[PDB]
Amino acid sequence: TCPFYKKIPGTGFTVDAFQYGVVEGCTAYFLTHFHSDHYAGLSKHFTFPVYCSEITGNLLKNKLHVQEQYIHPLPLDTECIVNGVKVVLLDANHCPGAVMILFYLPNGTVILHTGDFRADPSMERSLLADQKVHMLYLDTTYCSPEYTFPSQQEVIRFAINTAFEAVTLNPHALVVCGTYSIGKEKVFLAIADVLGSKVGMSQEKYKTLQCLNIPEINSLITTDMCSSLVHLLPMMQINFKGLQSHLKKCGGKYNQILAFRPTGWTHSNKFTRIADVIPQTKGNISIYGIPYSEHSSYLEMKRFVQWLKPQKIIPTVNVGTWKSRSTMEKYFREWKLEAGY
Ligand code: NI
């Protein structure tokens, strides 16, 4: 049974609610982005209207085989009427095709559902500038002040400089980057651009990237692994055993691996600056954990909410424990007392 924080009151709508069977009263199912916890339950047998971005609809059609007649892609930054209700989709600064959804209810209430997002000051100049929001359904993944990490631009600078130094010292070093979902494509694309290489990957991963409307993508990726010195592998294979095994398969073309695991936050964030990050090494294999996040830090989240000044906040992450819920509610009240709304 569908939880309350996935339902939009005063509408026939749900958000990211495909694993509950036929939800009573739902006339339109919105999907914020193509991450498995959010699409869980969709397949070629689904026969209700799904509303989403163009990119998310390419993934639904090609990867999950949802039939075309049930996919309703909407343009971003554009007022659209869905089943009698005005909606807008906004870029969420999460993975490719991820959106926030603004709902203009028939009684005058305005609701923002962030989906998953990484808050940014650029959002203060979107269509959100123009009107009041009564209710905020908030991605609270890192809602505690211990969650700090650098900007995505600092992290990519570290990765490019690390990879270029290693491969210039040793032209026979291979770079490997871990992946298990869409998102974080700048990691491997920026490294391959500084090295003058295409990124090599499995046919299944190439297929996924071909759905993402990334400009000039045919110039940047390939299934011919032998032609490439940046390889993508499943995240589970980014360990010394898995990497040793991969190096065997390369036919003595390479004699060293430098590997990246883009995680979100790890508690090595509570002590170490990006500048000071060092790898784990065994023999001719080195593995870097880099803190590339596609969710808001605590400070980014607090700035966005203090700017928006919602009347009510509904968390959508960390809702299963009483300790999490009480922690989040305390911070919401601090923020409101500090800013004066
Ligand atoms: Ni996500």
UniProtKB/Swiss-Prot annotation:
Annotated protein name in UniProt: DNA cross-link repair 1A protein
Subunit structure: Binds constitutively to TP53BP1. Binds CDC27, which is itself a component of the anaphase promoting complex (APC). Binds PIAS1.
Known outcome of mutating residue 139 to N: Impaired nuclear focus formation, reduced interaction with PIAS and increased sensitivity to cisplatin
Induction cue: During mitosis. The mRNA encoding this protein contains an internal ribosome entry site (IRES) in its 5'-UTR. This 5'-UTR generally suppresses translation while specifically promoting expression during mitosis, when cap-dependent translation may be impaired.
Domain of life: Eukaryota
Gene for this chain: DCLRE1A
Tissues of expression: Expressed in brain, heart, kidney, liver, pancreas, placenta and skeletal muscle.
Whole sequence portion shown: 700 to 1040 of 1040
Signal peptide: none
Organism whose genome encodes this protein: Homo sapiens (Human)
